[PDB]
Amino acid sequence: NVSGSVKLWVDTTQVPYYKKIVANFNKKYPDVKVKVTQSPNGSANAKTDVGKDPAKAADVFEVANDQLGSMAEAGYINPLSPDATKAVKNNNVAVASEGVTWKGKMFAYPFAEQAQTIYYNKSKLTADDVKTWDGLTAKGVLATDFTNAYNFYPVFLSAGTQLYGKTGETVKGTDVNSAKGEQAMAWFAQQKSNKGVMQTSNALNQLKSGKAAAILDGPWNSANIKKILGKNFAVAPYPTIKLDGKDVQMQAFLGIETFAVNSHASGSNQKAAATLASFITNKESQLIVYDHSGQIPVDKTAQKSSKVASDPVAGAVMTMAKPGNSTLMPKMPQMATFWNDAAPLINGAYTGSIPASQYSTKLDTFVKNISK
Numbered sequence: 627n628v629s630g631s632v633k634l635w636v637d638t639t640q641v642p643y644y645k646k647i648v649a650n651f652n653k654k655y656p657d658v659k660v661k662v663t664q665s666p667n668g669s670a671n672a673k674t675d676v677g678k679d680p681a682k683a684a685d686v687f688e689v690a691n692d693q694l695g696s697m698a699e700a701g702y703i704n705p706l707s708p709d710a711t712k713a714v715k716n717n718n719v720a721v722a723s724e725g726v727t728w729k730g731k732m733f734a735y736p737f738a739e740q741a742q743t744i745y746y747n748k749s750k751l752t753a754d755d756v757k758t759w760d761g762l763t764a765k766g767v768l769a770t771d772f773t774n775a776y777n778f779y780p781v782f783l784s785a786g787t788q789l790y791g792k793t794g795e796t797v798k799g800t801d802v803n804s805a806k807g808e809q810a811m812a813w814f815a816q817q818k819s820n821k822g823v824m825q826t827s828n829a830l831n832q833l834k835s836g837k838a839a840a841i842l843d844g845p846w847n848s849a850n851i852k853k854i855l856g857k858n859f860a861v862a863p864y865p866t867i868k869l870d871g872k873d874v875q876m877q878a879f880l881g882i883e884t885f886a887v888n889s890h891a892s893g894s895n896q897k898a899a900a901t902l903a904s905f906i907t908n909k910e911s912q913l914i915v916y917d918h919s920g921q922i923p924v925d926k927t928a929q930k931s932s933k934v935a936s937d938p939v940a941g942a943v944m945t946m947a948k949p950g951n952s953t954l955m956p957k958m959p960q961m962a963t964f965w966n967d968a969a970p971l972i973n974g975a976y977t978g979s980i981p982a983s984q985y986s987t988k989l990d991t992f993v994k995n996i997s998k
């Protein structure tokens with residue numbers, strides 16, 4: 627039998643359907659008392675929401691896979707048991723297991739596959755128009771945010787550099803301090819004068835108001851964008867960009883969204899928390915998430931279900947996940963420093979605060995900063 631009390635943190639607009647999932651959980655586990663709330667600052671900030679006071683934080687919380695190495699090394703999350711590991715590994719696609727594994731051990735329960743795509747108004751742009759960045763932006767406005775390194779760091783990967791080495795596990799393996807890194811910096815700088823590229827802190831609002839024909843966004847907004855665009859909804863994988871005069875696919879990050887168990891819990895509450903985390907990331911629960919938000923399951927069977935297989939967003943995400951089209955976010959503890967330093971590097975190139983004469987110096991300093 628499973629008993630105990632568990633606090634669950636989810637992202638703000640997810641609460642209504644996690645309440646439905648928790649109702650399903652309580653059919654099987656009637657004696658577990660779950661309190662579902664939004665988190666203080668969302669899954670993109672889980673490591674600090676938990677770290678500021680682990681005993682006060684939720685017992686089960688939503689967290690993106692890049693944060694897991696930091697949280698594991700800090701002792702905020704424990705390895706999954708052998709049986710829990712086997713379930714994750716057997717039920718979900720390979721990259722989901724890679725996403726939650728740190729030094730050979732799993733530290734979270736994966737449930738969704740996240741890659742950004744182009745979302746666009748098909749009354750304004752065609753499927754052919756969105757194949758290239760310059761071609762798209764010559765025909766309509768793309769709204770985006772150059773202060774967000776999750777949006778734009780992958781251009782360095784398109785340029786042929788590595789982030790923490792071949793597989794994201796090599797502390798000294800970022801090699802962006804090179805001519806290839808400079809090519810990415812120059813691409814950011816070019817976009818400042820591209821009249822079809824609109825800098826904004828709220829790209830989705832620009833799509834809603836009609837000021838943008840296209841945005842880059844992820845599947846957490848799939849159902850949201852389908853509602854906004856209605857019969858004009860369309861989606862595509864990322865386009866090619868020109869780097870050093872060559873067309874290359876513009877990458878996104880591949881992220882795995884997860885739930886983790888707070889290591890503070892003990893006794894019955896710990897068992898209840900692990901049971902909840904397993905349940906809310908099971909196939910049925912992943913399909914409920916899909917039905918509400920459009921997020922893409924990592925469960926092998928769910929991905930091949932008719933409804934997911936016919937969804938154009940799922941198809942675009944599956945394309946994005948292929949080698950060359952994205953890179954799995956690394957989960958090194960150093961990712962904290964990476965994210966902090968990457969945003970001003972990219973935005974400085976875009977705004978011109980970093981001129982071309984300084985690209986090499988700034989990239990050298992960046993690599994030193996993130997490679998300790």
Ligand SMILES: OC[C@H]1O[C@@H]2O[C@H]3[C@H](O)[C@@H](O)[C@@H](O[C@H]4[C@H](O)[C@@H](O)[C@@H](O[C@H]5[C@H](O)[C@@H](O)[C@@H](O[C@H]6[C@H](O)[C@@H](O)[C@@H](O[C@H]7[C@H](O)[C@@H](O)[C@@H](O[C@H]8[C@H](O)[C@@H](O)[C@@H](O[C@H]9[C@H](O)[C@@H](O)[C@@H](O[C@H]1[C@H](O)[C@H]2O)O[C@@H]9CO)O[C@@H]8CO)O[C@@H]7CO)O[C@@H]6CO)O[C@@H]5CO)O[C@@H]4CO)O[C@@H]3CO
Pocket residue numbers: 636637638665666667668669670671673674690691692693740774775776844846881883962965966
């Ligand atoms: O809008 C939808 C979301 O709304 C709600 O989110 C709001 C927050 O609740 C509210 O607090 C606020 O956030 C601001 C915050 O208050 C400020 O303090 C500041 O944040 C700084 C932060 O405090 C610092 O510690 C630091 O953060 C670093 C962080 O520690 C580190 O891990 C890393 O972050 C990177 C992630 O780890 C990485 O995974 C990736 O994040 C992706 C993510 O993977 C992907 O899923 C996607 O996230 C979606 C999410 O799935 C959706 O559910 C939806 O979330 C809503 C929230 O749940 C609500 O709480 O939308 C999300 C965004 O699309 O996209 C993420 C990328 O955007 O990359 C991360 C790096 O970008 O590095 C950071 C930076 O070093 O620095 C912070 C910045 O100063 O700023 C906050 C934002 O203004 O406002 C939120 C709404 O904007």
